[PDB]
Amino acid sequence: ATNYIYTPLNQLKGGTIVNVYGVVKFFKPPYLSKGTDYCSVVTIVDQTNVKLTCLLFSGNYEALPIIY
């Protein structure tokens, strides 16, 4: 069954595959990086004010999460 243990973002260590929640404190719209994939940058914050950065890579915009 579907499950998610939302936990303060600081606990999300490298190599871990996680299910999370947060407000977007800052983000860049999808832009083409040196690589082949457009990179969208997102800074997210949870209810405990803890932060996480996300780099969302895709060859196009539509494949990425929808944020405005």
Added chain:
DNA sequence: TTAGGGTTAG
């Protein structure tokens, strides 16, 4: 792989 948020001088 890249990038991995913060002012151009147009």
